[PDB]
Design a protein around this ligand. Structure first.
Ligand SMILES: N[C@@H](CCC(=O)O)C(=O)O
Lengths: 48, 50
């Protein structure tokens, strides 16, 4: 068996990344969506 | 954090002494505890005696 939680304890400590990891996913999704919107707008406005 | 102030000891499990080296530990000389560590074959206790 290998659960074996020991050593430094986050419970006595900060928020881990796993507690706010959703915000980073939303942020990178928004960045990708913004680049995609800019690319489709440029594709529309170009070739003429 | 500035409301609740839990302490937590660094050697809670009583086995961490066998892995850590920053905390020294010993027993009374010429006593039952020293002989217990000297003779016990339990792996963790063997580590402590070593
Ligand atoms: N002093 C006794 C018992 C250990 C103790 O002090 O608790 C002995 O030498 O074995």
């Amino acid at each position: 068996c290998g659960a074996k939680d020991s050593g430094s304890k986050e419970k006595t400590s900060a928020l881990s990344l796993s507690n706010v990891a959703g915000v980073f996913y939303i942020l990178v999704g928004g960045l990708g969506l913004a680049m995609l919107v800019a690319l489709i707008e440029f594709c529309y406005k170009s070739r003429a | 954090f500035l409301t609740v102030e839990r302490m937590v000891s660094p050697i809670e499990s009583a086995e961490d002494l066998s892995k850590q080296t920053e905390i020294a530990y010993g027993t009374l000389d010429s006593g039952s505890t020293k002989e217990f560590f000297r003779r016990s074959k339990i792996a963790v206790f063997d580590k402590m005696w070593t």
